[PDB]
Amino acid sequence: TVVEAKSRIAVVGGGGSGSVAAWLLARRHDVTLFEADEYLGGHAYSHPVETDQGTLHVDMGVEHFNEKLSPNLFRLLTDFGIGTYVAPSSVHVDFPGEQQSWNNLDFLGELREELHEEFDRFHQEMNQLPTSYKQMSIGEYLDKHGYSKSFKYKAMNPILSIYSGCHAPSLDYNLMYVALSFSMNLLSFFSAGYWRKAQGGIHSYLARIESDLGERVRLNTPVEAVVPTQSGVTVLAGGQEHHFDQVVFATHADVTLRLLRDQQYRDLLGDFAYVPVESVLHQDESWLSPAGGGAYCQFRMPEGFELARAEEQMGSLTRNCNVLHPYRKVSSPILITFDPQEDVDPERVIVRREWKLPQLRPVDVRRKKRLHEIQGLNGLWFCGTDTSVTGHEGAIVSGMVIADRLGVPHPFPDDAPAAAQFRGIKEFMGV
Amino acid sequence: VEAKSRIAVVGGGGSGSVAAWLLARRHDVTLFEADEYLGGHAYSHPVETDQGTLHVDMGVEHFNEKLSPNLFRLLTDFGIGTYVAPSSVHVDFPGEQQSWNNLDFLGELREELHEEFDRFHQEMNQLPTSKQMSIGEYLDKHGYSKSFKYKAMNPILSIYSGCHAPSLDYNLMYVALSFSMNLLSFFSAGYWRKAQGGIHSYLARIESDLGERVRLNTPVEAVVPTQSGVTVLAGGQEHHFDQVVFATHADVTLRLLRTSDQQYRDLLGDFAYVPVESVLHQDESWLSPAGGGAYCQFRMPEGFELARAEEQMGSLTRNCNVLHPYRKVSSPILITFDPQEDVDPERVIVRREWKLPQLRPVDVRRKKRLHEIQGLNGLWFCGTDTSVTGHEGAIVSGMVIADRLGVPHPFPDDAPAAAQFRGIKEFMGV
Ligand SMILES: Cc1cc2nc3c(=O)[nH]c(=O)nc-3n(C[C@H](O)[C@H](O)[C@H](O)COP(=O)(O)OP(=O)(O)OC[C@H]3O[C@@H](n4cnc5c(N)ncnc54)[C@H](O)[C@@H]3O)c2cc1C
Ligand SMILES: Cc1cc2nc3c(=O)[nH]c(=O)nc-3n(C[C@H](O)[C@H](O)[C@H](O)COP(=O)(O)OP(=O)(O)OC[C@H]3O[C@@H](n4cnc5c(N)ncnc54)[C@H](O)[C@@H]3O)c2cc1C
Ligand code: NA
Ligand code: NA
């Protein structure tokens, strides 16, 4: 397929992937970016919180990345003159009994006493692993390598749930992803992980992308349908018909399919599994740990847990924002509880967000790769979290891959690691 | 070099011992050791406590499975366990609340320097993927404060370079790598492992495995390559060998060597060292009043002058009671390296005097050049001075020499251990 310059190209979905694709495609082509909600970024949302220090753009979805893991995102932020800061992944885990806890800052707690030897063995086994087990599950490994049910549900499951989704079948996800998160110091039982945050919310780089695009962006304009035709492609958005030569989808595969209007498409876009996530921005200081109230990530398992019913019981993850270095002078509590099990005072709740995260079982990964088939067929292209590897870097680099295929080359060839990532994703996507 | 040859090993530290142990296979080896034990820098001193006798690591104590694969397999095969001893660091300076640590964000120095600690980590991480300059030159060219240089950079580097060392003159890549690999960090404790029951445990085993091939308290006096073979003068006796392997520091190697070739002085002279004094004591007045929970505690004495900063050195204490096996103990276990202030003689268990090599790019360039005199006049060189830094660097150079003498790398199966060996063998130019 040959795509001429100055073509009319639409971008459906304006999250991180859409926005990057739209922004690079604004060079070379005439682009329009359709976004259902009142802002750019989607999972990258920074909610304004009023405080004594000013207005804070509090990250409720996407929060963390770093310069090793996310090179392209890092250069992008740099060039936009956006600073990053270190937000170490300090973790404290609370369970029902007296002193029934553990943390990655000190060696205190009954669970630490009960489990230290397994935390220690785990780190060794994880590190020796990347160097069978090709697509294995973390749960299968734990069982086959004699780890206690206590480690499985009191250590493994909570740590995995500091992201990776609480509702998610965390113990079923790919072994290599856990082995890598541990070797790369993203998760650890002995130290806080090396995580970075963007200066003045993650939205900062999107807010710039938004200005740079200007009139090309349609906020509050949900697409209703994308109909490829003999002539070109027809987009029905915000009660109007639009004529384009190409259409780029940066929406979740389920949304992509509902908007697309062949049953090869139903095969490749249907069956994509998701996990509900509820981010709750609140100020109810009763969620803070009485012993670990100084750690960034605080996990709490409610009363009547019962280790035998462990698959049924679920804990809640709170994020102590006041522990973030920019929020040090701020006097008002800033908490984020994901999927709260116990109650959260409605009087103290700033806002709630309801999102869906893709599952990461090797089958889901196998599904993603297969999309290479419908790429650049009937003037359609697919990018986003569902077409790429996990994380923000994965999403925004996927948008870069599609933009590159439409004659806008990778913006940072100079940056060796950023070029390597792009080469990786382009290869993963089969584009 | 034919099999069943008579080979001597001068120096019985980690490198010697590993080389001797692998060379016991294929050849008839003798291991000469000046001191009463095997290991040298790897020393574990017995300390009596209510819970038991502890083999307290006073020299070499840190490694991990990523950094030290060969050392790790060696320990495993000998049935020796390892534990996590995170590199928690607290830095104390003369004023009120004039400190910083890698566990929390408290302290005046933390307030004064947070932005630079943060910038540093980014710059370090982006660097190996981008420099034969010093850490000091980099710091200066990249606008870092003299406060950062002497109150943050210099103390953190102290953990393994020694409070004395012109640490700021050491190569940049060594710092860039120590930071990217989470060995040193201003935001988290480093992933460091310790051997269970002291580091000596693996040496104590090689000692048994060698038996009568080991000659302790037998300092070599001279190594004279002859027309016939080589002649070793050790403990007032003449010994006849076909090959001689030196696992002693280059300065010691030269003093022992008697060759009449100027080149030897060129390659072995000019090697720079740094004195280190390890002090195993129980004087709790060395613990930080604020950071007494961190593993590595640095203290700069009163009258520090930021302008005279090159002249003043601080002292590094190691809070052993923070180690997980030492958690039930009730007697303080401290190790102060190069104490500036007075340490109570009533509370001093023992002292050790050692010398560490300098790691300026010139020193690194010297090490590589030794490839010239290797396997000449029936002599071979291994050790800390012929290899990259650390215990792995040391024992793997002993393995490289053993492999050159027909004893192949013992762990080809272990992919990372094979890769390290391939690396060192290449670095050494052997
Ligand atoms: C709670 C949460 C926390 C996360 N934390 C991290 C983290 O710290 N780091 C990290 O790297 N990743 C994290 N992620 C993963 C995240 O999904 C990705 O990082 C990335 O943001 C996904 O980008 P995306 O644009 O493909 O998806 P989305 O962000 O979901 O973008 C899709 C967009 O399409 C829009 N859209 C939907 N329907 C229509 C329509 N009809 N017409 C037009 N537009 C439409 C949506 O409104 C949305 O803006 C997190 C995700 C969640 C949900
Ligand atoms: C205080 C200190 C702490 C350290 N901590 C660490 C750490 O945590 N981790 C790490 O990886 N590295 C550490 N090191 C670095 C250390 O030098 C190496 O890890 C390694 O132990 C060096 O091995 P080596 O055998 O080459 O040198 P050495 O250990 O010094 O061995 C040389 C041996 O030669 C002997 N010898 C000297 N003269 C003669 C003679 N005339 N005849 C015969 N034998 C002789 C000596 O007695 C000694 O046993 C530390 C070093 C010191 C001094
Ligand atoms: Na600690
Ligand atoms: Na912290």
Author numbering:
A (entry chain B): 2 to 132, 137 to 266, 269 to 438
B (entry chain A): 4 to 133, 139 to 438
Text from the published report:
The X-ray crystal structure of the holo protein was solved at 3.15 Å resolution by single-wavelength anomalous dispersion (SAD) using data collected on seleniated protein. The LkcE monomer contains two domains, a FAD-binding domain and a substrate-binding domain, which are joined by a substantial number of loop regions. The FAD cofactor is present at 100% occupancy, and as in other members of the MAO family, it adopts an elongated conformation. LkcE is clearly a homodimeric protein in the crystal, with an extensive interface (4705 Å2, representing 15% of the total surface area). In contrast, the dimer interface of LkcE is formed exclusively by the substrate-binding domain of each monomer. In all but the SeLkcE structure, one Gly (299 or 300) was an outlier, whereas Glu313 was an outlier in both forms of the holo enzyme structure.
